[model samples]
Target: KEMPQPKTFGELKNLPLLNTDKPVQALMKIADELGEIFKFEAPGRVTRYLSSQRLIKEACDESRFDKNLSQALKFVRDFAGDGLFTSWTHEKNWKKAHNILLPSFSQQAMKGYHAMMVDIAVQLVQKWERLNADEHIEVPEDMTRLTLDTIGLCGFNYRFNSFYRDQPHPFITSMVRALDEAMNKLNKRQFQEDIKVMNDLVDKIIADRKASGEQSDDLLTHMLNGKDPETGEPLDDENIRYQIITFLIAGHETTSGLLSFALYFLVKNPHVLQKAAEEAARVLVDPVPSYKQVKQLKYVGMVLNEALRLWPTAPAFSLYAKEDTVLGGEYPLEKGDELMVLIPQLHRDKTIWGDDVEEFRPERFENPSAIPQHAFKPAGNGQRACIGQQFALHEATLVLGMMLKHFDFEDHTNYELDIKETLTLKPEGFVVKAKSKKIPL
Candidate 1:
């Protein structure tokens, strides 16, 4: 066979990964095959990858971000990381936006979102109740609906009523199409159409809020009222649109993935599932537990953490260098040089999480403080960490607690995993059968 010449880095930019259930793992295996700091040569693009957890942490400490998002996320609203999209934003803008929005997802601020989340969760329980115990359901779709409904209500003071609808909302359909722009590398026309629909919808909402001259405690209100701490200028509609889109996409995608995968792991681990259910049963005296009550779900927390460990919703993050730099005081990195952190590889590393890193034992997080801060980044950490992370956790805790309290999920051991990797890692073929145990209080 004749040999082919490798394309330059820029030329490879348009190329996409062969879709897979485990992209990070696939990338990690490629790293092992090609050496840790190897070039992932596609057609025009050739980028370096950081496969080591320690080196990733060291680089995080030393290097300024390359901040180049993958092509897959190009249609994700503004595409330039801003506001809630701090992870995608470059340094200057990220700092300004991060500082402004930081207080919105605070412990106290998040409490206001609880009643709304509980309302959405209660609706979810009702939906599940209508499903017969013997009926099988694809859970990720349901989880997506729940998270979208919750985020739409709490994040935007908007109602998607996702669970209530059979057909997806126009925003969701367009949003999914936009996500497809990055992955499948198709749907440019529909993508733009969807984008326009979403943007117009958000603009109308913003205008409505202005016309009413009313201020609410929702995230959108915070973003609207947010001002640059340094400049004292309010966020523009463009930026606000970007931030809302970021929250709309990143917000629900992550937690929905978490909920779906968490259920999968629980089903796979029957004893583990039973243990978590017992905790939920004991704590959830009410049909819909309050934020305070759900927060007491220690076992459920452990399971959630373990699921994140096994499958980080955002599996890998890309970083590049601004100038010549030594990563972890070792590897030489040049300006515009790109590197990626394989989160799944790092999280499951034997050195960090012990030799049994691959095991689905939620007990590892029993003492969460014991885990290294950088080692487990299901929702990321530090300055650019997910603003809605605490919010996501609280919502998940509520949904998981309520679901576990009333129902026992039956394992679909025969089903094969069909994972989807767009921006977040999601299970496409994960199915669950439920048997109502104790009726909801």
Candidate 2:
């Protein structure tokens, strides 16, 4: 008999699908059943799934983060219909824009935003205090509000005050709609209107800044002043709008999803929770932790990493082979071939993490040498890895420590993990209860 065809999980008769109505569990199962390097195609184009860490690290190119499979970029284009973040931008244009934005996320730039981040965390504590002891807190909703407000302040010097508002900001409302469209692959024409509302908002910000002529060393200020190093020309209004939308989407949604997932794991795993809390108490003696203090919350960092291992917001991403490449020196592919890195599969691999891969053990991250390369890529790898890794880590650690220090979380196991997908993985209706722990003198 002829050899049997490879069994692929998500692919249909005609199209090779990635996102499903309920995706995470389904995707994980598919990766486990099928071996690494399965072929998936849509119409004339082909995409490959690279699930093995060994295959990914050795065969996958490390030096580049520039190109993405255009198939993957289609979803992003629904929201960012015309930006550098979308597939429409040329390689030359993207390279220029990346160099300009890189400096704004540098370590020196992050230091300036610490006070603002702490102030927001403090505000969240106050909000929790106003709630009833028995009241259930919606993790994704509250965390999203906090992150939206933080990104507004830090990225653009605007304040959404999401926690206090009865209604979300128009920009937020529109962005969420765009996310819905991206995930569902719906032909939602109204998303264009949402983009309109956001563009107008960005336009107003740029005009106001120019009209005020006030000088502040912020991301917006940098963008306003940055020139095309090749041509010494300022970025056009359309590119500027694209950059603003890109920042709000990435900085707001992804980090909030991360926080929500971290809190969920911490609540479910009591021993892990206690360890994190003890470390929080030890390091954060004050209401607000400084940048240095947050860095010292080592166990909390591990908890966040472990949480990310289970539920990365940007869970799976696709990169195109710039040239004909041999994966693991076994699978051969053409130059135009695409590779999808299933990060969750690699994170949960028993080979690398040992038998406890399914368990919530933050302790695994305590020793750095134990982890092999490309096994724990929470922020991605190489030139294309998240530029905001340091920024997210500092802000998240400070927020987690401060929250745990002032309050105690109650487990509500009745609430199921109703996860949903967009360009990112999100909790649909996950909720937990909280009560004040104690008051400091």
Candidate 3:
């Protein structure tokens, strides 16, 4: 019972390249034609794509398959350099950094980052307030600003001050350039130049922290001061640089996409927006939500989850067999054969999600237990799952709560959802006109 695949090289040639601009959509369409499990051959490799719930669950079994850096993530390693997200499974620093940085995202640490998160969220609200009634705010661009600024302040005690500026920070510009090159398979010289810009900024962050003699509990401080419990050695400067860049890129990018897509859905579906707005009003009583209040934003969390279900920011991740194994007891795979989990199609599995899977209904997530395990992994899977999951969620909860509380959004362009793919997915041309809600004095 083997799965379907293109019969010949010519058949494979007609399919879209995995590196295309809309790779997720391209794969989804292929899944529609080829059925659940299928193999596609590239120049030097044959990769299997898994779209069904059962097959993806079997692949998620750590005993069978381990995480493999996808083609895009491998490109990121040229800049990220053994950071947690891009590090190979056997890399030592992945565990060392993982252990040292674990507490930075704990409950108390999130409490510490809350004030800073709210400060940045306020900046966003104020920026939106200033926009003219007819002005359209680019959803993804502003969400990027908000998340980047939040991560800068929360993680490194640095400020991108994105809202205050017309152009984005230099770090963002260069990071985007490098990622764009990686996505489009473009120039290496230009990629190195872009990498230099990011490295220089991170280098300065490390140097400035040392010179100031500040004992803050930010991630940079932890990486510099904390030692590996097993080895009892502090992270070297080069490794610290990699970790900072990883946090900057991983911390902000996916969460920003989450917020962007959530807003797109909020504007497009008025009923859902009204329910979410009512929840925000009920829970976020003050102008700024407290850390506890953010936890109370249950509906906003649902909206974020549903948005992720519809458009997972990081849409796919690669895994490879630890040994020769048969997926779903049917498709044969050899050791080291690459298997990609197509999340966009997996999330829409009709069996797991019911017939209304295509709708933007947040209630599907109300009963988490009802949904099968390994079904929805927007963040990722297993121990290598997103380290900053709570950090991203809290930031999104606070920002969404405040944004919904203070503003009313209308789709400015009546635009269909078009995703812009770098390493992550974001609503490409989504724009909205936001009007401030009148508060009683």
* Reference-based lDDT, each prediction: 0.75, 0.73, 0.86
Q: What is the C-alpha lDDT profile of model 3 across 1-441, one tens digit per residue?
A: 866775454655424465566767888888988878888776556788899898999999999899998777888888989989998777898888888888887766898889888889989888888887558888888998999988888778889889988988888889878877877761678788889999999898899888988977478887888998977877888889898888888878799999999998988899999999999999888876899999999989999999999899989899989999888878888999999999988998998898888899999889878878999998778878888999999999899988899998888679898887778889888888888896421
Candidate 1 lDDT by residue in tens digits, 52-108: 677777656544654565544544534423545644564566666777788888877
What would the per-residue lDDT of candidate 2 be over residues 122-173, giving only the tens digit for each residue? 8887788779756888788888888888777777788888887878988898
User: Using Cα atoms with residue i matched to residue i, what is each candidate's TM-score against the true structure?
Assistant: 0.90, 0.91, 0.96
Relative to the true structure, candidate 2 reaches a TM of 0.91
Question: Which ranges in model 2 have alpha carbons more than 4 Å from their true place?
Answer: 1-19, 63-66, 81-84, 87-90, 186-189, 228-233
Q: CA RMSD for every model?
A: 3.8, 2.9, 1.9
Error of 3 at 155 (Å): 1.8
TM-score of candidate 3 relative to the true fold = 0.96
